[PDB]
Amino acid sequence: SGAIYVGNYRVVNRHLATHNDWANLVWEDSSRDLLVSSTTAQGCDTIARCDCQTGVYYCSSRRKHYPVSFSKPSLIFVEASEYYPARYQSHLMLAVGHSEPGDCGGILRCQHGVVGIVSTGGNGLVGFADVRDLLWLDEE
């Protein structure tokens, strides 16, 4: 679990969006596993606006922050699960690292801020849903 809090927005994995989130929807994209909901209180996360391919992610299943090299956002095939049928997920970045289902929501960060959140994994890999292209997150 985990979320990004920037301005009056809460960014979470779409598959983990609570009942309170859909009743306050701003934007969602199933093909990106992302959902953004409005918040009453202002958040303090800064979104990165860069093309960094190295960063640090939080892994809840190990209670540890790991440094990683990650690929550029891409259209990647993601195996069927209890949340989605087998499909291509867009704006996905992969890294060699540990992850388990309960790890989605963990933040990936570089020297410029929040890059994205854990969204996929398996086989000694971890996938992150990129948020750096969502320029509107900086304004309202």
Ligand X SMILES: CSc1ccccc1CC(=O)N1CCO[C@H](C(N)=O)C1
CA geometry: angle 23, 24, 28, nearest 5 deg: 100
Q: Please, are residues 44 and 5 in contact by the beta-carbon 8 Å criterion?
A: yes
User: 3-state DSSP call for residue 63?
Assistant: coil
110 binds Zn ion (CB under 5 A): yes
Instruction: Let me know if 15 is a catalytic residue.
Output: yes
Residue 55 interacting entry, from ligand X, Zn ion, none, C-beta within 5 to 8 Å by type: none
The alpha carbon of residue 122 and the mean position of all alpha carbons in its chain are separated, in whole angstroms, by 16
Q: Return the range that interacts with ligand X (CB under 6 A); candidates 17-25, 68-76, 80-88, 107-115.
A: 80-88
The neighbour count for residue 91, using CB atoms within 10 Å, is: 23
CB-CB contact of 23 with 126 (8 Å): no
When asked if residue 100 is in the footprint of ligand X (CB under 6 A), the reply is yes
Binding ligand X (rule: CB under 6 A), the pick from 91, 99, 114, 134 is 99
Among the listed residues 118, 78, 91, the one whose alpha carbon sits nearest the alpha carbon of residue 32: 91
Minimum distance of Zn ion from residue 6's CB (angstroms): 15
Query: What x-and-dash track marks residues 2-41 binding ligand X by CB under 6 A?
Result: -------------x-----------------x--------
Write out the residues near ligand X by the rule CB under 6 A. 15, 33, 78, 81, 83-84, 89, 99-101, 103-104, 118-122
